[PDB]
Structure formats: C-alpha cells, structure tokens
C-alpha cells in the first residue's frame, strides 16, 4: 500500500508521471529507485493533452515529480 | 496526535491533499511513508473548485504538499 | 526557550501558522514533530485577513512555514 | 566569531531578522537552535520600516532567513 | 533497469540532458556520479531546438536536471 | 586554494557577499562556518550600486549566497 | 572522467561557470570542494554575453551552478 509498493507493482506497466511545472511524461515503467527517480521506455512528453516529444528511453528525476499514477 | 499518527488514522478514509498552488487532490488514503509521500485511490485533481483529472490510484510526493486534511 | 520548547508549550492552545503568501492558518495545536510539521484541530485558512476555508483537523508541513505564533 | 556565537550573544537582546522578501521581524531574541530557527518575544513584522503586525512570541524558521542583525 | 544502470550503460553513448528550464544539453556521456551530475564530451546546448553553444567537455549538475535520455 | 581556505584568510578583512537576489553586502568578515554562513561587521547592503542600509554586525545565511569575493 | 576528475584536471585552467539567470562567470579555476563550490582568479561576471563585473578572486557556491566547462 506504500508509495514504493505501488511503483514496484507498476513495473512493465504504463504510467503517467506528473511534473511540478505543468506537463507530464507517459510510458512503460521499467525501473526506479528509492528517491523515486524513474526510467520509462517508449515515452511521450505530454503538454495540454498533446504529445510533444517521444523517447525510446528516459530517466526522470524524482525531485521534479509531483505524482505518479498507474494508468 | 503527531503528524504521522493523524495520517495513519486516516487509512481507508477520504482525505484532502493541498498542494503549494491552491491546487488539490481528493481521494481515499491507502498508503503513506515517513516522508509524507501518500497514495490515494479513486482520486481526482481539483483546480479552482473543479475536477480536471481522475485517477484509479495516484502516488503524490510529500515535498509538494502544503497540508493534508482527513475529510 | 528553544523553538521546539515554545511549540511544545502550545499544545491544546490556539496558534497562528504563517505561510509565505499572505496566507496563514489559525487553529488549536494538537501535535507536531521535530521537522515542525504541525497538526491543528478546528482550523481556518486565512487569505488576506479573511477566512477562506475551515477544517476539522489538518496536518501542515513545516517546510512551507515562515513562523508559528501562539495566540 | 562564528554565526552561532553571535546569535548566542544576542540572547535577551533586540535583533532584526531579515527575510528573503524585504520583510523582516524585529523583537527580543529569547531562543534558537542549530538550524537558526529563532524565537522572538514582543515581536513585530515590518515592511519598509512600518509595523504591519505584532506578536507576543513567535518562532521563525531559519530556512526563510536571509540574515540576522543584533541591534 | 534502475536509473543508474541506464546511465552507466550510456557511457561513451549520446545522451539528451533536459534541465528544468526548457533548455537541454546533448553530447557524449563520458562520466557521472551518484548525484546524477554528468560529464558530456562534444556537447551542444539546445533551446527550442536551436544549438546555441558547443563545448569540448562540460560538467552538468544533477540538481537542475529534469531528465536524461540515451538518444 | 579551497573555498574555505580563501574564506578563513579573509578574516578581519573586507569582502563582498553577492546574493542571488540582485543585491550584495559589503563589510568586514569576522566569522563563518562550514555551511558558508558568515558574519560581517560595519556592513553595507548595496543595491544597484547604492548603499541602502548599514549594519553594525550581521549574520548572513550561506544558502542565499551566490558568491563571496575578498575585496 | 567523473565530474570531480574533470574539475580537478582544470585546476589553474580557464573555465566557464554557467549560472541560472543567463549569467555566467569566466576565470581561472584555482580551488574547489566536494560540493562543487569553486574558487576563480581574475574572474569576470557575464550577463547575457556582456561583461558587467571583474574580481581578482571569488568563491562561487556550487548550489547555484548549472554547469562548468573547461575552456
């Protein structure tokens, strides 16, 4: 039920990573660490519902993260 | 009585998570950790009084939190 | 005379929690921890000298706190 | 003379606590901790040399402090 | 694949380092540390899609990094 | 010449403390600590080149400092 | 070539220190510490490509640094 528990079971699952600034990243979670830094495969940066960029793989730093939700 | 006791007593209960933006989340509290990162189930993001997003489950990082209130 | 001493003496007493914003919370202090996260019961959120919201119980994170004054 | 030495020497004396705002608190220093959180007695919040609020006692968090000057 | 595994695997490979302020750096990853500070060789600062500077080598601090993507 | 070595040697001497706020402090360095908090005597707060405030003694928190230059 | 190795090798060499507001410092690196605080000799503060100030010696706190590049 804890924050890390949820992230753990989202491995290989699609997730939404909400950033503090105002945009988001969506992709398949393939890794993470205790600081909540995360690694996404086949990711897309989203802004106002529009897919702006895509990455084969991206490591996001948890300090910028507002929230993470298994979609 | 302490911050963590209150959060612990609110498991499985509706709570309000106020962010440093007059921006908030409301949902059922299902998990948390010592950094005050929290996990809500059946959540909704509220902006200026209205629902702008919904999540089956969402992990919110405590560093962005202003306050949490059991509802 | 130390910060935590003053906070401890304020338990079950009315306090003012000033945030950086012109915003503040006023309520009965019922708990706290070493990081200055505090719990208020029968609380009010004040914006520019006016009550904009009320809460039965609220946990406020010390990281957003400018000062706390026992009333 | 170390920052901590100066603060210690200002106990029970009047001091100016400058905030990263243009705002400041002025009052009698009655306590402090290693993080530079400080407690003031018979304190006032000042803006451009004018009193905007008064406090019998107030705990100010060091994280928001720019500087402290004993007067 | 944990964050550090991906970064390690990217040594001598091309990477995109996105900073919290809209701009990015691109170059060959030649070094890094546990804080996610990174060293890029033959790097390019990019703003809105325009290369504005080139560096033989450049050390970027992880505290300002939003994300890192092995291209 | 490590950062701290340069500071220690400026004891009793005139220094310029540049803040990440657009202004600076100038005065005689009479103390400091490992966090780069510093104490200045006969200090002058300078803004846009003009002295806008003067202090007999002032403790400046290092977290708001951009740089320190021994004049 | 981790971050610190690169900085070490730049001792007594010209370096560019990029800051967060379109500001930068250029000078000869003569000292540094593990926090990436750095000391520069014969330094210039540059704003949007224009030299606005000069310092015989200056200690720059690493917390404000975005990047460092040996010239």
Q: How far apart are CA G65 and CA G22, in angstroms?
A: 12
Tokens linked to A13: 């699952």
B5-43 CB burial, b ≥16 within 10 A, e <16 = ebbeebeeeebbbbbbeebbbbbbbbbbbeebbbbbbeb
Q: Is C23 on the interface with B (CB under 8 A)?
A: no
Q: Is E7 on the interface with A (CB under 8 A)?
A: yes
Tokens linked to B58: 């969402």
G63 DSSP assignment: G
CB A23 within 8 A of CB A51: no
**Residue F62: which residues within 8 A CB-CB, separation 6 or more?**
F35, F36, F37, F38, G61
Instruction: Tell how many helices (H) and how many strands (E) occur in chain B.
Output: 1, 5
Strand pairing of D65-70 and D50-60? Answer: unpaired
Where is A10: in which H helix or E strand?
none
User: Per-domain residue ranges for chain B?
Assistant: 1-71
In 3D space, the residue among F28, G35, B59, D15 whose CA is nearest the CA of residue A8 turns out to be: B59
In 3D space, the residue among B37, B68, B50 whose CA is nearest the CA of residue B58 turns out to be: B37
**Residue F5: which residues within 8 A CB-CB, separation 6 or more?**
G31
Q: How far apart are CA E25 and CA E66, in angstroms?
A: 12
**Residue G58: which residues within 8 A CB-CB, separation 6 or more?**
F67, F68, F69, G25, G27, G39, G40, G43
Tokens linked to E46: 């990019």
Q: DSSP string spanning C30-57?
A: EEE-TT--EEEEEEEEEETTEEEEEEEE
Tokens linked to B39: 């996990």
Report the Cα–Cα distance between both ends of chain A, in Å, rounded.
17
Tokens linked to D14: 């009047």
**Residue A31: which residues within 8 A CB-CB, separation 6 or more?**
A11, A38, A39, E1, E2, E3, E5, E6
The partner residue sitting opposite D69, judged by closest CB among F37, F58, F63, is F58
Neighbours of G1 (CB within 10 A): 15
Q: How far apart are CA A26 and CA A47, in angstroms?
A: 11
Q: How far apart are CA A2 and CA B32, in angstroms?
A: 5
In 3D space, the residue among F63, F71, F69, F66 whose CA is nearest the CA of residue F33 turns out to be: F63
Report the Cα–Cα distance between both ends of chain G, in Å, rounded.
16
Neighbours of D15 (CB within 10 A): 22
Where is B6: in which H helix or E strand?
helix B3-9
CB B64 within 8 A of CB B19: yes
**Are the beta carbons of B69 and C55 separated by less than 8 Å?**
yes
CB C15 within 8 A of CB C69: yes
The correct CATH number of A1-71 out of 1.10.1750.10, 2.30.30.100, 2.60.40.1180, 2.20.25.240 is 2.30.30.100
Which residues face B14 on adjacent strands? Answer: B28
Tokens linked to B21: 């933006």
Catalogue the long-range contacts made by C37-45 (C-beta closer than 8 Å, 24 or more residues apart). C37/B3, C37/B36, C37/C61, C37/C62, C38/B3, C38/C7, C38/C62, C38/C65, C38/C68, C39/B1, C39/B2, C39/B3, C39/B6, C40/C15
Diameter of chain C measured on Cα atoms: 33
What are chain D's partners, defined as 3 or more CB pairs within 8 angstroms? C, F
What are chain B's partners, defined as 3 or more CB pairs within 8 angstroms? A, C
CA dihedral (G30, G32, G38, G43) in degrees, to 10, reads: 0
Q: How far apart are CA C50 and CA C69, in angstroms?
A: 18
Distance of CA B29 to the CA centre of its chain: 7
Radius of gyration of chain C (CA): 11
Strand pairing of B65-70 and B50-60? Answer: unpaired
Q: Residue E64 in 3-state DSSP?
A: helix
Where is A37: in which H helix or E strand?
none
Query: Where does residue A16 rank: exposed (0-12), middle (13-18), buried (19+ CB within 10 A)?
Result: middle
Q: How far apart are CA C48 and CA C52, in angstroms?
A: 9
**Are the beta carbons of F67 and G57 separated by less than 8 Å?**
no
CA contacts within 13 A on the Cβ side of C31: 14
Q: Residue C8 in 3-state DSSP?
A: helix
Query: Where does residue F15 rank: exposed (0-12), middle (13-18), buried (19+ CB within 10 A)?
Result: buried
Q: How far apart are CA D29 and CA C11, in angstroms?
A: 22
Tokens linked to E30: 């030649």
**Residue B49: which residues within 8 A CB-CB, separation 6 or more?**
none
Q: Is G6 on the interface with E (CB under 8 A)?
A: yes
**Are the beta carbons of C3 and D57 separated by less than 8 Å?**
no
What are chain E's partners, defined as 3 or more CB pairs within 8 angstroms? A, G
Nearest CA in chain D to C65: D61
Q: How far apart are CA G16 and CA F38, in angstroms?
A: 26
The partner residue sitting opposite F39, judged by closest CB among D3, D20, D63, is D3
CA dihedral (F15, F20, F21, F22) in degrees, to 10, reads: 60
Q: Residue A5 in 3-state DSSP?
A: helix
In 3D space, the residue among F50, F63, F48, F57 whose CA is nearest the CA of residue F28 turns out to be: F57
Instruction: Tell me the structure's resolution in angstroms, rounded to a single decimal.
Output: 1.9
Q: Is F12 on the interface with G (CB under 8 A)?
A: no
Q: How far apart are CA B13 and CA D48, in angstroms?
A: 47
CA contacts within 13 A on the Cβ side of G47: 4
DSSP H stretches of helix in chain G? 3-9
C22-60 CB burial, b ≥16 within 10 A, e <16 = ebbbbbbbbbbbeebbbbbbebbbbeeeeeeeebebbbb
Catalogue the long-range contacts made by B26-33 (C-beta closer than 8 Å, 24 or more residues apart). B26/B71, B27/B55, B27/B58, B29/B70, B30/A1, B30/B57, B31/A1, B31/A2, B31/A3, B31/A5, B31/A6, B32/A2, B32/A3, B32/B7, B32/B8, B33/A2, B33/A3, B33/A4
Tokens linked to G41: 């000799």
Report the Cα–Cα distance between both ends of chain F, in Å, rounded.
16
Taking CA C40 as the corner, what is the angle to CA C35 and CA C41, rounded to the nearest 5 degrees?
Answer: 155
CB A62 within 8 A of CB E68: no
**Residue C50: which residues within 8 A CB-CB, separation 6 or more?**
none
G30-41 CB burial, b ≥16 within 10 A, e <16 = bbbbeebbbbbe
Taking CA B45 as the corner, what is the angle to CA B39 and CA B47, rounded to the nearest 5 degrees?
Answer: 145
Please indicate the experimental technique that yielded this structure.
X-ray
**Are the beta carbons of F64 and D66 separated by less than 8 Å?**
yes
**Residue C64: which residues within 8 A CB-CB, separation 6 or more?**
B20, B66, C19, C20
Neighbours of E3 (CB within 10 A): 21
Q: How far apart are CA G47 and CA F47, in angstroms?
A: 17
Which residues face D59 on adjacent strands? Answer: C68, D39
């Amino acid at each position: 039920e804890r924050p890390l528990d949820v992230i753990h079971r989202s491995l290989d699952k699609d997730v939404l990573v909400i950033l503090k600034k105002g945009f988001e990243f969506r992709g398949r979670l393939i890794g993470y660490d205790i600081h909540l830094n995360v690694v996404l495969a086949d990711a897309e940066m989203i802004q106002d519902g529009e897919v702006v960029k895509r990455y084969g793989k991206i490591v996001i730093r948890g300090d910028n993260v507002l929230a993470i939700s298994p979609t």
